Amino acid sequence: TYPFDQNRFVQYKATSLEKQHKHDLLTEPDLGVTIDLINPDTYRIDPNVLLDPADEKLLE
Amino acid sequence: MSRGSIEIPLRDTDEVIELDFDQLPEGDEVISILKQEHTQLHIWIALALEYYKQGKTEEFVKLLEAARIDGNLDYRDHEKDQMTCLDTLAAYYVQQARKEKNKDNKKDLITQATLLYTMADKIIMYDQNHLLGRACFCLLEGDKMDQADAQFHFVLNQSPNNIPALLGKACISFNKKDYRGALAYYKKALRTNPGCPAEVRLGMGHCFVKLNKLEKARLAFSRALELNSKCVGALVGLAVLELNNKEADSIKNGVQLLSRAYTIDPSNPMVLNHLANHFFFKKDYSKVQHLALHAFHNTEVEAMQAESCYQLARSFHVQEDYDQAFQYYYQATQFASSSFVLPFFGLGQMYIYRGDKENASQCFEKVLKAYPNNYETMKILGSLYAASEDQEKRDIAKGHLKKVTEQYPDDVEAWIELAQILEQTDIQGALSAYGTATRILQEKVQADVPPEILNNVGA
Incomplete structure (x- = not known):
């Protein structure tokens, strides 16, 4: 036996x-995606805020 | 220009005290003023929300707790404001419970949130924000995912463009592995509100990673950091993407990203586990142990605990503390996911140290089942089975060693072990194997032939 x-x-x-x-x-x-239920302005839709091209690439 | 002001009406008079949001006085005085003037609850909540936006959480907590007792209810829809107060306080305690390190404080915070939600049920049991709060709260307990899914579905049935409900559905879909549904919900949320939080891109990033869409994942995490530079989750995501490239520059980038994450949150388990792995390659076992032990105590996720146990075991393994290494490898196999087989290899090696070749073989078989044709696993399992009394195991060992010698013909031990197996049924094969080992030893190792090989060749 070796x-x-x-x-x-x-x-x-x-x-x-x-x-x-x-x-x-x-x-x-x-x-890690905290859903904010305290500040009502966090999800308030401002019609003047246009989509940035960096976000657009993610939505494409 | 100033951020704004709020009007406090003086009791039974037409006079008003104006509080500037940029120069808000101390909360104890504000509470005393609001209490003496018997001020309406919506003002208490609005003030608390402004303190919250400014990061003045102590005054926010004091104001909402005081408002539950002294906030005047003599106005229309005061019940909705009571619901708002109870749900905001409960949601804040849930957020603290998510951030809380002490399990007793965490349990107390969860109990307080439960009590607050149970009190709110008596006011407006089916309020949309109340349902969102309860659905998000169920995710902390984890076993109530189906209830959260039903609640988010109810909110979406009334308001299908509700961002919190879309994020809730995305999170549950991701945990249920429906990454396309989750990504669709995150995409709908971002398409509906371009001003969404940075964390919306983090969720998209996670979906892109699980969908193997590495470019969009990298873009999503970078965009999250561009909007919120304190996003540890995005730093971890990018670090994992860079480390997985295996390039020297990407490995360096990963370590830099982890160092940035550590400077932001030195208690994060993913950051600590990857830093421990890095210091392991730097041979700083003291840091490996310190980081991995702290990481193990900082998370409840079995897959992360398993990785921490693997780092611990590997540190003890290099220190020859085979008993602690065995304990941590064993614990890691108990906590390990179906994809994380690295602990079985270490456990198998420790079983060899303990001489338990049967359980060692089972450990290596589990590794080989996950990583077929792997050189180290085939070599070890072949060697373990070569000594077995079962003829089928000897035939299996023969097969594995044949693959090993074909992949790595310079491994002298694999040739000798194969020769020892062939002696029983193929004398010419055994001679060829010993001759090859002899040739490798003489030409490549340039060492003299061992007497055992000469004897076996003679036989």
């Missing part, structure tokens, strides 16, 4: 799995 070091798989080695794993975007149950 005398393999018993600890060869116990010692920490940086695996390909660890290097290649892509992080998932985890969030708290409310997803």
Whole structure:
């Protein structure tokens, strides 16, 4: 029986799995999107505020 | 120009005291004035809301609590203002409960909000703002998502362009994984009101990420930070997007984004977990442990706790504290999601240290089932099964080691282990395997041939 070091798989080695794993975007149950129910002006629709091109790209 | 003023009518007289919103006096005096003059409740609420916009939350809290006792109700629709007072105070306590670190204070805040909502039920049980408050409150408890869905649906049936109801539906749809519905609700909200909060783009960003729409996700998080520079959630989103690029410049960007998030909120679990991972690569295990332990205590999300446990276990693993590493890997496997198999690899290694090759094999099989044809997992599982008495396991080991040697022909150990398995059924295969190992040792490792290999070749 070849005398393999018993600890060869116990010692920490940086695996390909660890290097290649892509992080998932985890969030708290409310997803960090606070729905404001205190200030009534927060969702008040001002007809003079035009949509910015940066928001338009998200809506396209 | 000044932000505005509010009129306080003096009792039984035509005289009025004008309070400037830019020079509002101390709340205890305002409460005393409003109480002595028996001022109507809408004024108490309006003042509290102005204090709130200015960040003067202590005066806002004092005013609404005092208003419940001394706010004069001798006017039309005072009941709607009572509802507004109770729902605003309950919603604020819910927001605090979301921000509160002490579980006892959090439970007390939740109890107070519940009591306030139960009191409001006796005034106007089906008010739209009341229903929005209760639906948003159900999300903190988590088990009442179906009730929140029904309540948001009722509000949308009366006002289908209601931004809070659309955001509520979007959040529930996202938790139920209906990312297209969630994105559609967020898009409708932003299309209806261009002046929406920055957080509306954050939700869109999360939907784009889950829909693999990385460009729109990056734009959404950047736009959220452009509108609200304190948006930690957007910094985390961008950091995750940059870290996932695997490029050196993106990795650096991710670390910079995380550092900015840490300077804004040093208690955020996502920021702490990614910073722990970064310091791990920098070998600063003291920071890894400090950050991961604090992160573990700062969240109730099992998937985040599992990642914190994995960071902890990996730090103890490098420190050779195989028992604590085992405990944290084990806990991580208990908390781990169906996609997070990294804890099983570490646990498998600790089972090897403990000699429990059967559970180690099960751990590595779980990893291999998630990541098929992975070199390290096939090598370890092959090695573990090679020593097994079951002939099928020996055949499995033979298959895995064949794949390992085909992918990495320079791994001497994989060739030796394969040779030891082949000795039983294919003498020529075993000879070829030992010959290859011998050749690699002599030509590439330039080391003398071990006597065991020479003996086995002789046999």
